Amino acid sequence: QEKYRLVVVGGGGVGKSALTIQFIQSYFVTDYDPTIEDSYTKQCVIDDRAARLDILDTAGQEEFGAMREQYMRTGEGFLLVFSVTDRGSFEEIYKFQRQILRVKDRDEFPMILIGNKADLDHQRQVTQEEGQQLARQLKVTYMEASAKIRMNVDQAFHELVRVIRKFQ
Ligand SMILES: Nc1nc2c(ncn2[C@@H]2O[C@H](COP(=O)(O)OP(=O)(O)NP(=O)(O)O)[C@@H](O)[C@H]2O)c(=O)[nH]1
Ligand SMILES: [Mg+2]
């Protein structure tokens, strides 16, 4: 009888939807269809403790920036996603962290930094050490993922739940 409202945020095209669809439906989307805001649910067992995960897949497009206050108010944990092949998305993810903490009026709040598209090994603009450094700056953990090859997809969501449980 436990549930978590998880929210996937980050800049446009970094793979928020591809990660979420791989997690929910176990298939990889090739087309890039920009999201306004989509919702999904999954029943999981994390550390032998069952939990329903209600996932909000949000807009990376600035056009829909005004919807952030609403979803940031109600989110219980956030996956901060950037693409390792897009340095702009890497430099911009801190803006999402700042807005979450401003809406929560808190110095810390459950989050994890995800460097997606790690399968694009020959196209990287951000090294693994750079992502780990940014995570330390933001006081969160770092995980690299690939929606394409389904690397660390379930793990990213499970780990966010673990972080949320430690904040309680
Ligand atoms: N090689 C590779 N491509 C990926 C990966 N994740 C997403 N992509 C791709 O990158 C594009 C955008 O992915 P998408 O999930 O729609 O990104 P998004 O962050 O939801 N975009 P938006 O903010 O506009 O909703 C796609 O064409 C998709 O196939 C990945 O892990 N590896
Ligand atoms: Mg999307």
SSE series = EHEEHEHEHEH
| CATH topology descriptor | Rossmann fold
Task: State the separation between the terminal residues, measured CA to CA.
Answer: 16 Å
Second rung of CATH, namely the architecture: 3-Layer(aba) Sandwich
Instruction: Provide a count of the helices.
Output: 5
The major β-sheet equals:
6 strands, mixed
The total domain count is 1
Structural class label:
alpha/beta
Strand content: 25-35%
Give the CATH level 1 class: Alpha Beta
Strand order of the largest sheet: 2-3-1-4-5-6
Radius of gyration: 15 Å
Tell me the overall shape: globular
What binds here, in terms of ligands, is: phosphoaminophosphonic acid-guanylate ester, magnesium ion
PDB class: oncoprotein
Keywords: RAS, rras2, TC21, oncoprotein
Assembly: monomeric
Entry title: Crystal structure of RRAS2 (RAS-Related protein) bound to GMPPNP
